[PDB]
Design a protein around this ligand. Sequence first.
Ligand code: ZN
Ligand code: ZN
Ligand code: ZN
Ligand code: ZN
Ligand code: ZN
Ligand code: ZN
Ligand code: ZN
Ligand code: ZN
Ligand code: ZN
Ligand code: ZN
Lengths: 351, 351, 351, 351, 351
Amino acid sequence: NKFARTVLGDIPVEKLGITDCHDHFIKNGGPEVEEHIDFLMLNVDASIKEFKEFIDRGGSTIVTMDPPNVGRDVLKTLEIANAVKNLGGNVIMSTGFHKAKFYDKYSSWLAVVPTEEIVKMCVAEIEEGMDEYNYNGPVVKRSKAKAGIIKAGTGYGAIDRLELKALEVAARTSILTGCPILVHTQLGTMALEVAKHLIGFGANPDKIQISHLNKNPDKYYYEKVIKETGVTLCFDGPDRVKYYPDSLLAENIKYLVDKGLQKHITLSLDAGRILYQRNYGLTKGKQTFGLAYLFDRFLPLLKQVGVSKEAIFDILVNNPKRVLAFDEKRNFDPLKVSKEVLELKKELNLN
Amino acid sequence: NKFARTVLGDIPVEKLGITDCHDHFIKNGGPEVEEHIDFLMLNVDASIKEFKEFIDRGGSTIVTMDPPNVGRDVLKTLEIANAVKNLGGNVIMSTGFHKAKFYDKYSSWLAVVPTEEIVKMCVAEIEEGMDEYNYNGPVVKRSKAKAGIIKAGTGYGAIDRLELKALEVAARTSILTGCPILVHTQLGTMALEVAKHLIGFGANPDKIQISHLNKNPDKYYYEKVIKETGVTLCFDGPDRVKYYPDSLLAENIKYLVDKGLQKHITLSLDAGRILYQRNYGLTKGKQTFGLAYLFDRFLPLLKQVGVSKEAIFDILVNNPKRVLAFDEKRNFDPLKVSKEVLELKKELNLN
Amino acid sequence: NKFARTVLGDIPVEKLGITDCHDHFIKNGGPEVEEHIDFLMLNVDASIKEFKEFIDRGGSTIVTMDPPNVGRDVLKTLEIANAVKNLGGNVIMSTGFHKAKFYDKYSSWLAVVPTEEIVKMCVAEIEEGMDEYNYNGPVVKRSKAKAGIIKAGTGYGAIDRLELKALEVAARTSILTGCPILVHTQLGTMALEVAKHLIGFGANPDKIQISHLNKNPDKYYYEKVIKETGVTLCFDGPDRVKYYPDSLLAENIKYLVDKGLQKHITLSLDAGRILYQRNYGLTKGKQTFGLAYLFDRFLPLLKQVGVSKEAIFDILVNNPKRVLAFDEKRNFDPLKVSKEVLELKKELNLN
Amino acid sequence: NKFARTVLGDIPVEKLGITDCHDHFIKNGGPEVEEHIDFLMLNVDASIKEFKEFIDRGGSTIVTMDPPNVGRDVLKTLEIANAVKNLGGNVIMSTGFHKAKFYDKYSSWLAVVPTEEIVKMCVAEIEEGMDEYNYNGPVVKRSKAKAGIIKAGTGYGAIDRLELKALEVAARTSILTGCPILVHTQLGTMALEVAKHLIGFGANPDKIQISHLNKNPDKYYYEKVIKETGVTLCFDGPDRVKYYPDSLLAENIKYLVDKGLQKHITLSLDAGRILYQRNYGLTKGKQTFGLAYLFDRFLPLLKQVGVSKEAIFDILVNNPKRVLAFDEKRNFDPLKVSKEVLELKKELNLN
Amino acid sequence: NKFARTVLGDIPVEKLGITDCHDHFIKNGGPEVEEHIDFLMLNVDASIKEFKEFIDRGGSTIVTMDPPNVGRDVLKTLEIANAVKNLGGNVIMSTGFHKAKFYDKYSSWLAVVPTEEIVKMCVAEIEEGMDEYNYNGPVVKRSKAKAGIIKAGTGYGAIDRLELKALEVAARTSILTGCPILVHTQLGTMALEVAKHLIGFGANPDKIQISHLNKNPDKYYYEKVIKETGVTLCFDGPDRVKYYPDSLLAENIKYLVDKGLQKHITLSLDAGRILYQRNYGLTKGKQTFGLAYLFDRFLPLLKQVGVSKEAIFDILVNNPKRVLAFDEKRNFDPLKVSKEVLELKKELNLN
Ligand SMILES: [Zn+2]
Ligand SMILES: [Zn+2]
Ligand SMILES: [Zn+2]
Ligand SMILES: [Zn+2]
Ligand SMILES: [Zn+2]
Ligand SMILES: [Zn+2]
Ligand SMILES: [Zn+2]
Ligand SMILES: [Zn+2]
Ligand SMILES: [Zn+2]
Ligand SMILES: [Zn+2]
């Protein structure tokens, strides 16, 4: 009797269906918008339209990976989820943290608040309800919607002490609530160490997804991470030509499948800029691709390069059915934390 | 029987002595540091040495104007206060807000949390204790030290809707607790309108300082603001040549005193960059001026252009003793808010 | 028996009334918007409201100084004019050019097209109708509305060769049509030389206004320019604190009046950024000053520093009535251009 | 009996010879130069020397792809063409448009002037003569030289509404005059959609080249575009290491040849920065590669990876003889435009 | 029998005539040019013509204040000097250093080489001949031309430890050789301390000029510096409207003269950007002001505001004849350095 926690309540995992495991609709301000205006995405109407295209093509579930302090909007996302619920659409929202670059290293709550206290706060979003004020300040107003996954983030070619902190937070929260974990890696760097640290803390590899490996297109590395740790690689990459062509990802996915690793791969669009969805594009007077592109162009390319229907079905349906399912709750035991992790925490002044 | 609220406790106002009404020692990250590395000031020893030169010269009290989310550091500022208390040094800390530039207009708590609830949070800093975590997230740990003034801020040539919200917060908190108010203006613009709105909300002009008028060196405007509203103008500007020479502030002050407005003037250094203090300067391998310059150079210049010792004594001692003294508490009545302010809030979508 | 040429037709100069000699409402794209998004001003309703406030205070005429290739929008500006005509509002539009910084120095029509052909195009806007496509390409579609002044612009501390060319275009078009001229100077530099070159070309000093001298607050210079050339100084500057305080402009205007030069001064707000008007400011969620500030704040300051009622009446009414009045048409004789101007044109490679 | 339209007149296509399908010599100002001084290219002598090296290696024709408003220089390009005509050199110039980013979205003639009128202006450059003033304003002075191709451009990962407008201008101009079309794509994105839209408007796929696919090195995509639409891919990329190594392009071209697609490929250097030509390089005191590199290095690399001498002959000679040849003139019939295109124009607010 | 040291030899001070005490003609690369292309000044012919206008107006001597590492060009400046010597023109060149901003703080020779060794190098330039390679590396090739003054520089609102070192270098060189000193202040800040420090090292106030006080227009400050130290203030400022109007400097000079301080003022244009000279301006296709403006515009303004002809003769002729005259050689005794200076060197880590 396994379940996934959607903003509208817990569902049996058999109801996940085809799942986009890392995406966006609303990004309401926050540090990312600070980097470029294209990250501001505030249109419920355009988001609903895009979600309906995804559903038209066969999809059901979208995991919106915005942590409370970086863009997340509970109220507007709830509007979307309610608009598509009668159509079979599901939304899972996230608690937790993004990479350190997005938090003030001197005075942010990630930096200053004891880990145990931050855990209580992320547990509360998984089990009681998400803060409608997104943990922006001292006033909290909890939604009835709960988060169903927790996030952490690592930076370019380095795991910052605060990132190791957030990973500990992810692991403990997952340990305590049973919830899945997904981690943003920057250009697909430090993926192996992210998995190792999470597992070293006590997290279940079965519940771990690592995003953005597409930006480090090293098929050997992909296979190493999977075989050494048992985690799952959530790829984005389709229609991101300023990074890498679609063909590059299709062939690296084929390799992993040929090596028997098809149960450890999920897909996403990570459409987290305004021009990365079709309907959002229209609001900007532009023709752009969005969620339908996955079905209209990328999956056919997977088939063309020789990935089987069966492996595609694992990627879209069975793998997410597994990695997003809640585990049973457990106690967190500090004495089970690996020595490698403890020694790193000491080196990084985290205790 | 009036008192001022210092971080070490309430003191009779006769103990304030010569008072620097707007300054800094610790700025611990935050949005300002984002603009320039020089805003990052993290040295308690350097701070204490500088406070001791200020005291050596005759000073006693420094009001550190850092609102919780912009640079404020309760723990480190307490270290500084404790180091000089036995020299008769006093530190007053601030609650409230800075100008809107420093808050995410979409998702910050200033933008999203109801005024009433923000007021509760600022009142608690004045009456229970400041959050050691500086209100930068949902976990709060209150210090024994309380804030003794509340801040608001306005931007260049404009009062943003969120700054009008912070001004209502400042007025409400002040009304409820009796605490003084100090408002940052940007280049000394909108000073008149800040005064008017605060009074319109029901705040006491006797408790209101407006900072930075020295950056809009308009003697007629100074006089207008003081005569029309009865607030106090807190000038910084000594050793700020990239803006205006010391002589200009000296002459403008001479004019106000000659007009009979000496009770409406306070002074400060606003040394909110690392090269604005002597001891901090030495930590970056430079000779720089700081708090002692007020006495060694600027007051002699005041005397030189013809400001009397009595007027100087009001500026440094009697004025602060008045405007920093807590008022008798009142209840806030929203129906007594002025029609001009009600109309503005409607126009800015605040109600 | 003189007329001014408004976008709704020529009017007796007695109908000009209180005139704002340099301002803006619509800035639709162009080189300025490239410098900052605040230069984009596209709101007809907000413009009309601001215009009505100006009329409410006693104003009648506004001269929108937008050359065709820099922001001008004939269609939207006509909407504003028609909205206020029944209130006695007048709008005068501009042909000609901005400072060289706004024109490609290699390939723009300013750089490349022979002066005589450019003159014909500017004459045509004065005498047949403004291009609704604003001279931004090879297709022209003329409005029934004609321009009633021509602009040129000079840059910081320099008159560029293309700017001398635009000065020649201005002088020739004014000579041929009788139209007035207004020149933008950058920070009030080169104003004397602008005056001299135009007169050198054959332009009537009586038709020439030079803007932005307020940004070079040198009373002796103001006096020199007026006494040596007889042109008119159009000041902006109220509520522009980042440059200079209102008080400085007032006192410099008092100086000029005291020297007998009150017939050579006009006033303007030059509200050419979106936060420089009250109603535009509301569209961005801010309280700001705009056109009414001239009457509510700056004119009373002029009185307060001692400028006579007659001088204010000249500045606001009689001087605009003189400088905006069309001259009798003349022919331009090139062999009559001053020797100073001829030599400079050789030096700058303009033949 | 087919001709190509060179700046020196129409020539039998058999006289095209080896053809560089996308290159540059003169870039006189314009928006690109605004991006980087390196785009400014003004040296006729250096350009003629480079052209002579190209001829010395066996080249004959160079298509210079500068649309009127972005860099184009009729006078100087004619100087180049006249200097090499007796050496067998041919120059073809372009009318039409660059990508939207290079035009003011509010006030540029692309934005504001009705499509039909723009078409007339582009047909005129093809059939009467190019404007020596490059359509940079309201004065036109036609050269005897005519353009022999029309350009459009699309931006990164999107076709802007104005770009769809320029594509319609390109299709209509080609249908009306018979001229060929070349489209800049940004990083090789949206190539398939560009092809379908042009075709949708009624353009002859046989007349269509699309540039920059080399920047999206996806052999499957290249193949899809060619097979589904019949257009021709004009690659640049030799000696552009900051994007991709020569080897990648060579291997992708080999792939296309192996799949039977060798008739759908042309080559170019797109030497549109000053350090992308040997002789221009010399003027800046640098050793750099230029046009000769095509023959000295890249074509030998194509042989090395196994591209047949026939495929290479097709790429350099036969394919350009087909794609650059004028079609018989036709009438444009709006009712023939595809439903997909019509629906998109509605979605983009283009009627 | 005093002499000044020009690049063509020692001259009797009576041959100085009207002397521009801080200016430029050639700025050949260096750290300044890295800040803005406008600092690049390479035109000997334009420089000569400008010098000739200066001479035509009555001027004789120009002190070019470029220290060896920042822009200085011995070869080209000699060309200029040689072209005007027969017109009675003199060029004095400089040794020493600019402000610390222009030297690598970690590894520049100023940072790393012991003070004593640097003094030897600067002494060599005054006494044997300037390095034609400008001390920009290990290979030295001395000109027959000697430097006739030594420079030092201080930064904004601070004297950097490396600037104190350079001040020590300046004092020691001056004490050893008798040469005069000129110090650039940044925005006219720290002028008092520069004076005190040089004096505390043992330099003669009679030989000291401090530049750029015009950027800190505080008349009381000017008087304090002169009255307390006896140094000379070298003003630039004419036609630098982006800082301050000419009228401000004229009035502040009038003040100093009225206080009996006319012997302590020199003048200069500091035309150290390419548009700050008339002839250089012409090479850029612009009309600009330069050296002649001193005589045509600024000196008449001085008279206008009431500065006497005798005060003006001092500023131009008598004062430079005093401050630029060599002192008799003396010995440097480090034991005689003021306690204030010793104390600061310890605080700044300079031992
Ligand atoms: Zn991510
Ligand atoms: Zn994402
Ligand atoms: Zn402030
Ligand atoms: Zn401050
Ligand atoms: Zn202007
Ligand atoms: Zn303007
Ligand atoms: Zn291109
Ligand atoms: Zn190109
Ligand atoms: Zn300098
Ligand atoms: Zn200089």
